[PDB]
Coordinates of C-alpha atoms and ligand atoms in Angstrom, one line a residue:
Chain A
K1 CA 148.3 77.7 48.8
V2 CA 151.2 75.5 49.8
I3 CA 136.7 65.7 48.3
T4 CA 136.7 62.5 46.2
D5 CA 134.5 59.5 47.2
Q6 CA 137.7 57.5 47.7
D7 CA 138.9 60.0 50.3
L8 CA 135.6 59.6 52.1
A9 CA 135.8 55.8 51.9
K10 CA 139.3 55.9 53.3
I11 CA 138.3 58.2 56.1
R12 CA 135.2 56.2 57.1
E13 CA 137.2 53.0 57.0
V14 CA 140.0 54.3 59.1
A15 CA 137.5 55.7 61.7
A16 CA 136.2 52.1 62.2
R17 CA 139.6 50.8 63.5
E18 CA 139.8 49.7 67.1
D19 CA 143.2 51.2 67.8
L20 CA 142.2 54.6 66.3
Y21 CA 142.9 56.8 69.3
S22 CA 146.4 55.4 69.9
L23 CA 147.1 55.3 66.1
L24 CA 146.3 59.0 65.7
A25 CA 148.2 60.0 68.8
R26 CA 151.5 58.2 68.1
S27 CA 151.3 59.5 64.5
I28 CA 151.4 63.3 65.1
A29 CA 155.1 63.2 66.2
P30 CA 156.5 59.8 65.0
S31 CA 160.2 60.0 66.0
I32 CA 159.5 61.1 69.7
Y33 CA 159.7 58.2 72.2
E34 CA 156.7 57.4 74.5
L35 CA 155.1 60.5 76.1
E36 CA 151.7 59.1 75.1
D37 CA 149.5 61.2 77.4
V38 CA 151.1 64.4 76.1
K39 CA 150.5 63.3 72.5
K40 CA 146.9 62.5 73.3
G41 CA 146.2 65.9 74.9
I42 CA 147.8 67.6 71.9
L43 CA 145.6 65.6 69.5
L44 CA 142.5 66.7 71.3
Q45 CA 143.7 70.3 71.1
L46 CA 144.0 69.9 67.4
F47 CA 140.4 68.7 67.0
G48 CA 139.0 71.3 69.5
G49 CA 135.5 71.5 71.0
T50 CA 132.4 73.0 69.4
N51 CA 131.8 76.7 68.9
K52 CA 128.5 78.0 70.5
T53 CA 126.6 81.3 70.1
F54 CA 123.2 82.1 71.8
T55 CA 120.6 84.8 70.9
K56 CA 121.6 86.2 74.3
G57 CA 124.0 85.1 77.0
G58 CA 127.0 85.3 74.7
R59 CA 129.4 82.9 72.9
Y60 CA 131.5 80.0 74.4
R61 CA 135.0 79.1 73.2
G62 CA 135.7 75.8 71.5
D63 CA 139.5 76.1 71.9
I64 CA 141.8 74.3 74.3
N65 CA 144.9 75.8 76.1
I66 CA 147.7 73.4 77.2
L67 CA 150.8 74.0 79.4
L68 CA 153.8 71.6 79.4
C69 CA 155.9 72.0 82.6
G70 CA 158.8 70.0 83.9
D71 CA 162.5 69.1 83.9
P72 CA 165.1 70.1 81.2
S73 CA 166.1 67.8 78.4
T74 CA 162.6 66.1 78.5
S75 CA 161.9 67.0 74.7
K76 CA 159.2 69.6 75.3
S77 CA 160.5 72.0 72.6
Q78 CA 160.9 69.2 70.1
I79 CA 157.1 68.5 70.4
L80 CA 156.3 72.2 69.8
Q81 CA 158.1 71.9 66.4
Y82 CA 155.7 69.2 65.2
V83 CA 152.6 71.1 66.3
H84 CA 153.9 74.2 64.6
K85 CA 154.3 72.4 61.3
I86 CA 151.1 70.3 61.5
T87 CA 148.7 73.2 62.1
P88 CA 147.3 75.0 59.0
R89 CA 147.8 78.4 60.7
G90 CA 149.9 79.3 63.7
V91 CA 153.1 80.8 65.1
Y92 CA 156.1 79.7 67.2
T93 CA 157.8 82.2 69.5
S94 CA 160.0 82.6 72.6
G95 CA 159.5 84.3 76.0
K96 CA 162.5 86.7 75.7
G97 CA 161.5 87.5 72.1
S98 CA 158.0 88.9 72.8
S99 CA 156.6 92.3 73.9
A100 CA 153.1 93.1 74.9
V101 CA 152.5 95.0 71.7
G102 CA 154.2 92.4 69.5
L103 CA 152.1 89.6 71.0
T104 CA 148.7 91.4 70.3
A105 CA 148.6 94.5 68.1
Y106 CA 150.6 97.6 67.3
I107 CA 149.8 101.4 66.6
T108 CA 151.7 102.6 63.6
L109 CA 147.5 106.5 62.0
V110 CA 147.0 102.8 61.4
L111 CA 146.6 99.6 63.5
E112 CA 148.8 96.5 62.9
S113 CA 148.6 92.8 63.9
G114 CA 150.6 90.8 66.4
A115 CA 151.2 87.1 66.9
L116 CA 147.9 86.1 68.6
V117 CA 146.0 87.9 65.8
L118 CA 148.0 86.3 62.9
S119 CA 147.3 83.0 64.7
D120 CA 143.5 83.4 64.6
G121 CA 141.8 80.0 64.2
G122 CA 145.1 78.2 64.7
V123 CA 147.6 77.3 67.5
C124 CA 150.1 79.7 69.0
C125 CA 153.2 78.0 70.4
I126 CA 155.0 79.8 73.2
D127 CA 158.4 78.5 74.4
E128 CA 160.4 79.6 77.5
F129 CA 157.1 80.8 79.0
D130 CA 158.8 81.2 82.4
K131 CA 161.2 83.9 81.1
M132 CA 158.7 86.6 80.1
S133 CA 157.7 89.2 82.7
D134 CA 154.5 89.5 84.7
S135 CA 153.8 92.6 82.6
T136 CA 153.8 90.7 79.3
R137 CA 152.0 87.6 80.7
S138 CA 149.2 89.8 82.0
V139 CA 148.1 90.5 78.4
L140 CA 147.1 86.9 78.0
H141 CA 144.3 86.9 80.6
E142 CA 141.7 88.7 78.4
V143 CA 142.6 86.9 75.2
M144 CA 142.5 83.4 76.7
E145 CA 139.2 84.0 78.6
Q146 CA 137.2 86.0 76.0
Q147 CA 139.0 85.3 72.7
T148 CA 138.9 89.0 72.0
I149 CA 141.4 91.9 72.2
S150 CA 140.2 95.3 73.3
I151 CA 142.3 98.4 72.5
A152 CA 141.9 102.1 73.6
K153 CA 144.8 104.4 72.6
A154 CA 145.2 107.8 71.0
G155 CA 143.1 108.0 67.9
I156 CA 142.1 104.2 67.9
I157 CA 139.5 102.4 70.0
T158 CA 138.1 99.0 69.0
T159 CA 137.8 95.2 69.7
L160 CA 139.2 92.4 67.6
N161 CA 138.6 88.6 67.4
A162 CA 141.2 86.0 68.5
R163 CA 140.1 82.4 68.2
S164 CA 143.6 81.3 69.1
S165 CA 144.8 78.1 71.0
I166 CA 147.9 78.4 73.2
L167 CA 150.5 75.6 73.6
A168 CA 153.0 76.6 76.3
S169 CA 156.4 75.3 77.5
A170 CA 158.2 76.1 80.8
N171 CA 160.6 74.8 83.5
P172 CA 159.9 75.0 87.3
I173 CA 161.3 77.5 89.8
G174 CA 164.9 76.4 90.5
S175 CA 165.0 75.0 87.0
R176 CA 164.7 71.4 88.1
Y177 CA 161.6 70.0 89.8
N178 CA 162.1 70.1 93.6
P179 CA 160.1 67.4 95.4
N180 CA 160.3 69.2 98.8
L181 CA 157.9 72.0 97.6
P182 CA 154.2 71.5 96.7
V183 CA 153.3 71.4 93.0
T184 CA 151.7 74.8 92.8
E185 CA 154.8 76.4 94.3
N186 CA 157.1 74.5 91.8
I187 CA 155.0 75.7 88.9
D188 CA 154.9 79.3 90.3
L189 CA 152.4 80.9 87.8
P190 CA 149.9 83.2 89.7
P191 CA 146.4 81.6 90.2
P192 CA 144.5 83.9 87.8
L193 CA 146.7 82.7 84.9
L194 CA 147.1 79.1 86.0
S195 CA 143.3 78.8 86.2
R196 CA 143.0 79.5 82.4
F197 CA 144.7 76.3 81.1
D198 CA 142.5 73.3 80.2
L199 CA 145.4 70.8 80.7
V200 CA 148.6 71.2 82.8
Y201 CA 151.3 68.5 82.4
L202 CA 154.1 67.5 84.8
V203 CA 157.0 65.7 83.0
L204 CA 159.8 64.4 85.1
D205 CA 163.4 63.2 84.4
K206 CA 163.2 60.0 86.5
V207 CA 166.1 57.6 86.4
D208 CA 165.3 53.9 85.5
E209 CA 167.6 51.4 83.8
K210 CA 164.6 49.8 81.9
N211 CA 163.6 53.2 80.5
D212 CA 167.2 54.3 79.8
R213 CA 168.1 51.2 77.7
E214 CA 165.1 51.7 75.4
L215 CA 165.7 55.5 75.1
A216 CA 169.4 54.9 74.4
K217 CA 168.7 52.3 71.7
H218 CA 166.1 54.5 70.1
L219 CA 168.4 57.6 69.8
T220 CA 171.5 55.7 68.7
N221 CA 169.5 53.9 66.0
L222 CA 169.2 57.2 64.1
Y223 CA 172.9 57.3 63.4
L224 CA 173.1 53.8 61.7
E225 CA 172.1 55.4 58.3
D226 CA 173.1 58.6 56.5
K227 CA 169.5 59.8 55.9
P228 CA 167.4 57.6 58.2
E229 CA 164.5 55.4 57.0
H230 CA 164.0 54.2 60.6
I231 CA 160.9 55.2 62.6
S232 CA 159.7 54.5 66.1
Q233 CA 156.7 52.3 65.2
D234 CA 155.5 49.9 62.4
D235 CA 152.1 51.5 61.7
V236 CA 151.7 55.3 61.4
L237 CA 149.6 57.4 59.1
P238 CA 151.2 59.8 56.5
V239 CA 151.1 63.5 57.4
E240 CA 148.9 64.4 54.4
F241 CA 146.2 61.8 55.1
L242 CA 146.2 62.7 58.9
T243 CA 145.8 66.3 57.9
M244 CA 142.8 65.4 55.7
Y245 CA 141.1 63.4 58.5
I246 CA 141.5 66.3 61.1
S247 CA 140.3 68.9 58.6
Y248 CA 137.2 67.0 57.5
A249 CA 136.3 66.2 61.0
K250 CA 136.5 69.9 62.0
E251 CA 134.3 70.9 59.2
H252 CA 131.5 68.3 59.1
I253 CA 131.1 67.0 62.7
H254 CA 129.3 68.9 65.5
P255 CA 128.6 66.8 68.6
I256 CA 125.8 67.5 71.2
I257 CA 125.4 66.7 74.9
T258 CA 123.3 63.6 75.7
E259 CA 121.3 63.4 79.0
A260 CA 123.6 60.5 80.1
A261 CA 126.6 62.7 79.6
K262 CA 125.0 65.5 81.5
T263 CA 124.4 63.2 84.6
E264 CA 128.0 61.9 84.5
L265 CA 129.5 65.4 84.2
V266 CA 127.5 66.7 87.2
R267 CA 128.5 63.6 89.2
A268 CA 132.2 63.9 88.2
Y269 CA 132.4 67.7 89.0
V270 CA 130.8 67.1 92.4
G271 CA 133.3 64.4 93.0
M272 CA 136.3 66.5 92.3
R273 CA 134.8 69.5 94.1
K274 CA 133.8 67.8 97.4
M275 CA 137.0 67.5 99.5
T276 CA 140.8 72.7 94.5
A277 CA 138.5 72.3 91.5
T278 CA 137.0 75.6 90.3
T279 CA 134.0 76.1 88.0
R280 CA 136.4 76.1 85.0
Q281 CA 137.1 72.4 85.6
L282 CA 133.5 71.7 84.5
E283 CA 133.7 73.7 81.3
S284 CA 137.1 72.3 80.3
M285 CA 135.7 68.8 80.9
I286 CA 132.8 69.5 78.6
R287 CA 135.1 70.9 75.9
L288 CA 137.5 67.9 76.1
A289 CA 134.6 65.4 75.9
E290 CA 133.4 67.2 72.7
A291 CA 136.8 67.1 71.2
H292 CA 137.0 63.3 71.9
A293 CA 133.6 62.8 70.2
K294 CA 134.7 64.6 67.0
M295 CA 137.8 62.3 66.7
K296 CA 135.4 59.3 66.3
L297 CA 133.1 61.1 63.8
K298 CA 130.2 60.8 66.2
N299 CA 127.3 63.3 66.4
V300 CA 126.7 62.8 70.2
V301 CA 128.7 63.0 73.4
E302 CA 128.4 59.8 75.4
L303 CA 129.4 58.4 78.8
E304 CA 132.6 57.0 77.4
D305 CA 133.8 60.4 76.1
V306 CA 133.1 62.1 79.5
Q307 CA 135.0 59.4 81.3
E308 CA 138.0 59.8 79.0
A309 CA 138.0 63.6 79.5
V310 CA 138.0 63.0 83.3
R311 CA 140.8 60.4 83.1
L312 CA 143.1 62.6 81.0
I313 CA 142.7 65.5 83.4
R314 CA 143.6 63.3 86.4
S315 CA 146.6 61.8 84.6
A316 CA 148.2 65.0 83.4
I317 CA 148.9 66.6 86.8
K318 CA 150.1 63.3 88.5
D319 CA 147.1 63.5 90.9
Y320 CA 147.2 59.8 91.9
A321 CA 150.8 60.2 93.2
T322 CA 149.9 63.5 95.0
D323 CA 149.7 63.6 98.7
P324 CA 146.0 64.8 99.1
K325 CA 146.8 66.9 102.2
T326 CA 150.3 68.2 101.8
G327 CA 150.4 68.7 98.0
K328 CA 153.8 67.1 97.5
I329 CA 154.4 64.2 95.1
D330 CA 155.9 60.9 96.1
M331 CA 158.6 60.3 93.5
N332 CA 158.6 56.5 94.3
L333 CA 155.1 56.2 92.8
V334 CA 156.0 57.9 89.4
Chain B
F1 CA 130.9 94.0 95.9
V2 CA 133.2 91.1 97.0
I3 CA 132.7 87.7 95.3
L4 CA 134.0 84.5 97.0
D5 CA 133.9 80.8 96.1
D6 CA 132.2 79.5 99.3
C7 CA 132.3 75.8 98.4
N8 CA 129.0 74.0 99.2
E9 CA 127.6 70.7 97.8
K10 CA 124.0 72.0 97.7
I11 CA 125.1 75.0 95.7
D12 CA 127.6 73.1 93.5
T13 CA 125.0 70.4 92.5
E14 CA 122.7 73.2 91.2
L15 CA 125.3 75.4 89.6
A16 CA 126.8 72.5 87.7
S17 CA 123.4 71.6 86.4
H18 CA 122.7 75.2 85.3
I19 CA 126.1 75.4 83.4
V20 CA 125.6 72.0 81.7
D21 CA 122.1 73.1 80.6
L22 CA 123.6 76.2 79.0
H23 CA 125.9 74.0 76.9
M24 CA 123.1 71.4 76.2
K25 CA 120.4 73.9 75.1
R26 CA 121.4 77.3 73.6
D27 CA 118.4 79.7 74.0
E28 CA 116.0 77.6 76.1
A29 CA 117.7 77.5 79.5
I30 CA 117.4 81.2 80.6
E31 CA 113.6 82.0 80.4
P32 CA 113.8 85.6 81.6
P33 CA 110.9 87.6 83.1
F34 CA 110.9 90.2 80.3
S35 CA 112.1 90.7 76.8
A36 CA 115.1 93.0 76.3
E37 CA 113.2 95.3 74.0
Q38 CA 110.5 95.4 76.7
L39 CA 112.9 96.1 79.5
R40 CA 114.7 99.0 77.6
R41 CA 111.3 100.7 77.0
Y42 CA 110.5 100.4 80.7
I43 CA 113.9 101.8 81.7
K44 CA 113.4 104.7 79.3
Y45 CA 110.0 105.4 80.8
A46 CA 111.3 105.2 84.4
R47 CA 114.1 107.8 83.8
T48 CA 111.4 110.5 83.2
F49 CA 110.4 110.5 86.9
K50 CA 112.1 113.1 89.3
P51 CA 110.9 111.9 92.8
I52 CA 110.8 114.0 95.9
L53 CA 112.0 113.1 99.5
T54 CA 109.1 112.6 102.0
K55 CA 109.1 114.2 105.5
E56 CA 109.2 110.9 107.3
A57 CA 112.0 109.7 105.1
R58 CA 114.1 112.8 106.2
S59 CA 113.6 111.9 109.8
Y60 CA 114.4 108.2 109.2
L61 CA 117.6 108.9 107.2
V62 CA 119.5 110.6 110.1
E63 CA 118.7 107.6 112.4
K64 CA 120.0 105.1 109.8
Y65 CA 123.1 107.3 109.3
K66 CA 123.7 107.4 113.1
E67 CA 123.5 103.6 113.1
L68 CA 126.2 103.5 110.3
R69 CA 128.4 105.9 112.3
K70 CA 128.1 103.8 115.5
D71 CA 129.0 100.7 113.5
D72 CA 132.0 102.6 112.2
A73 CA 133.0 103.9 115.7
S74 CA 137.1 98.6 107.2
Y75 CA 136.7 101.9 105.3
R76 CA 135.7 104.8 107.6
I77 CA 132.2 106.0 107.1
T78 CA 132.0 109.7 106.0
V79 CA 129.2 112.2 105.0
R80 CA 129.6 110.8 101.4
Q81 CA 127.8 107.6 102.5
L82 CA 124.7 109.6 103.3
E83 CA 124.8 111.4 99.9
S84 CA 125.2 108.0 98.2
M85 CA 122.3 106.5 100.2
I86 CA 120.1 109.4 99.0
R87 CA 121.1 108.6 95.4
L88 CA 120.2 104.9 95.8
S89 CA 116.8 105.8 97.3
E90 CA 116.1 108.1 94.4
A91 CA 116.9 105.3 92.0
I92 CA 114.8 102.8 93.9
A93 CA 111.7 105.1 93.8
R94 CA 112.3 105.7 90.1
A95 CA 112.4 101.9 89.5
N96 CA 108.9 101.7 91.0
Ligands
LIG401 N1 161.6 60.8 74.5 C1 162.5 61.4 73.7 N2 162.3 61.2 72.3 C2 163.1 61.8 71.5 N3 164.1 62.6 71.8 C3 164.3 62.9 73.1 C4 163.5 62.3 74.1 N4 163.9 62.7 75.3 C5 164.9 63.5 75.0 N5 165.2 63.6 73.7 C6 166.2 64.5 73.1 O1 166.8 65.3 74.0 C7 166.8 66.7 73.5 C8 165.7 67.4 74.2 O2 165.7 68.8 73.8 P1 164.4 69.8 74.1 O3 163.4 69.5 73.1 O4 164.9 71.2 74.1 O5 163.9 69.3 75.5 P2 163.3 70.3 76.4 O6 162.1 69.6 77.2 O7 162.7 71.5 75.7 N6 164.5 70.7 77.5 P3 164.7 72.3 77.8 O8 164.7 73.2 76.6 O9 166.1 72.3 78.5 O10 163.6 72.7 78.9 C9 166.6 66.6 72.0 O11 167.8 66.3 71.4 C10 165.7 65.3 71.9 O12 165.8 64.7 70.7
LIG402 MG1 164.0 72.7 74.9

């Protein structure tokens, strides 16, 4: 394919650092400037929740689905490149490149695999998500909710497993974010599909001289050398070691809910609910908190993890800057 | 059957607790009245009954159907609703 006690010592020693969460996040995509919250959310998608199966009452998904939405030139697609190369298994694809059959499975009498099936247990990166038709996007409802694919065609009828995490990229209606429309109307996905993402990010091309000088200095510094040694930050982890950390934490660590975490989750859900938050906001909060716990090599979910899960959800969709009644965003607060 | 969110704090506070319990304990939360292998044996037994419509029930059915027709006078209520109501009553008697 393309362990030792020293590796365990290194992993345990790194896990004791105070700046661990920021260190890991800024190290998944070293040359990309800022976008810290986006990097953090992607890191938690890499770790994932915990998988659960009951004797009866079913099984519950550990995987996280993320949507990146916003202005052009904001470097969304560049981030999808890093995720596609970091993940052990996965696929990158485009909206105009995909059919309903190609995305799931194909009759040929034999059955054949599509992208979401090849990507099982990994991450499936979908770019230009706003270009594919309502017919093709309707296929994703069942696979995202259940993590299974049911088929019933001439001579073949069966169900297949798809433990696949989706990372999506799109631009708003009108192709540049319009502040005179509410956020849900700018995003323009129908509610049954928009309800299935754990995190939704707004990223905006806001002009600012302070930001622009730093961005310009960062991009122009890459052309001072033939094959650059330069990198955005002094301390980042090598890709190999980072992969080792993530892989080990996925295999050995399995956090559980503490009573304290249960009380905070109930309180937080009632807070978002009483005023719109659906029942899926609760489950996605649980899943994000579990992902945060694995990343610290803990066996228990605690109050700190729940509060981080809540904070990241509020930060992603620019809620603090949102008018609570009209649903428009004040660009001055960004 | 039409399902609606109907947001209410007194329901949300309980529903959230139920959901968090399912993620906190795997098997323990549900505590059903019967075992599945018990329930299937009961359902197999029940389907052997072939109940018969009582005289008073025949008199009562036309009154209830007239009430539905006057409510109707929304999908328009046809003779098929009476036939369906008879089917449901057969199933209810069989359940008992
Ligand atoms: N913060 C940033 N860090 C690094 N490169 C950036 C940044 N912002 C913009 N760029 C550069 O600007 C370009 C962005 O291209 P791209 O990744 O396609 O952005 P995008 O969000 O996908 N825009 P679009 O495809 O039009 O919706 C690339 O050359 C990036 O290197
Ligand atoms: Mg792009």
